[PDB]
Every structure is written in structure tokens, then in C-alpha cells.
From Swiss-Prot:
Signal peptide: none annotated. It is linked to Trichohepatoenteric syndrome 2: A syndrome characterized by intrauterine growth retardation, severe diarrhea in infancy requiring total parenteral nutrition, facial dysmorphism, immunodeficiency, and hair abnormalities, mostly trichorrhexis nodosa. Hepatic involvement contributes to the poor prognosis of affected patients. This is Superkiller complex protein 2. Helicase component of the SKI complex, a multiprotein complex that assists the RNA-degrading exosome during the mRNA decay and quality-control pathways. The SKI complex catalyzes mRNA extraction from 80S ribosomal complexes in the 3'-5' direction and channels mRNA to the cytosolic exosome for degradation. SKI-mediated extraction of mRNA from stalled ribosomes allow binding of the Pelota-HBS1L complex and subsequent ribosome disassembly by ABCE1 for ribosome recycling. In the nucleus, the SKI complex associates with transcriptionally active genes in a manner dependent on PAF1 complex (PAF1C). Component of the SKI complex which consists of SKIC2, SKIC3 and SKIC8. Interacts with HBS1L isoform 2. It is found in: Nucleus; Cytoplasm. The chain holds residues 652 to 705 of 1246 of the full protein. Belongs to the helicase family. SKI2 subfamily. The gene is SKIC2.
Length: 54
RNA sequence: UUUUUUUUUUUUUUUUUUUUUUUUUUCUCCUCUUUUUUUUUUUU
């Protein structure tokens, strides 16, 4: 919150919704592990993960 | 190359009292033999 930490590594416990967004967001993978079907992401998830940068 | 969420040890406390040991049965009941009754007296 106070900006004293630069690089953060987080799973979906912090991704899909937050206030106080940083400037940049990066994705290290294209897929995800839901409840044992091993699907890929969908626009409803990418909008939330990437929609908080400003 | 396997993410996200599923609460926990019932609440309460600042009520008066002018009595007194026990406690409650058992029925009438043939006494055998020398006597009148001796007696003063003195040594404690």
C-alpha cells in the first residue's frame, strides 16, 4: 500500500480483484488449474486480472 | 504443470422468614407355730 515493496508474486488470492493497483501486470502462463479439468483462462478472468492497472 | 472459499467456548443476579426437653397403657396377688412381750443394776 505504501509502495515500500517493488516486486510482488501472487496467485489468484490477490489477482482477480484489488483496489490500489500498481502500474504494470505480467502473466507468466496462459492456462490455469480449476477443479480437475485443466482448462485455460477465459475473458471473464483476463478482464479482472488485467483490468486493474490504473 | 494441481488455483479459490467454508464465523464461534449460555445471557442474568443488589432474596423476606417472628421457635424450644418430652410425646402414648398391662390385672387381682395365703409371710407356718415356746410365749406373755423382756426391762432395776454396774463397769464404754
Amino acid at each position: 500500500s505504501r509502495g515500500l515493496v517493488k516486486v510482488l508474486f501472487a496467485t489468484e488470492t490477490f489477482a482477480m480483484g484489488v483496489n490500489m493497483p500498481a502500474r504494470t501486470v505480467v502473466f507468466d502462463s496462459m492456462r490455469k488449474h480449476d477443479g480437475s479439468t485443466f482448462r485455460d483462462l477465459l475473458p471473464g478472468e483476463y478482464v479482472q486480472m488485467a483490468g486493474r492497472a490504473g
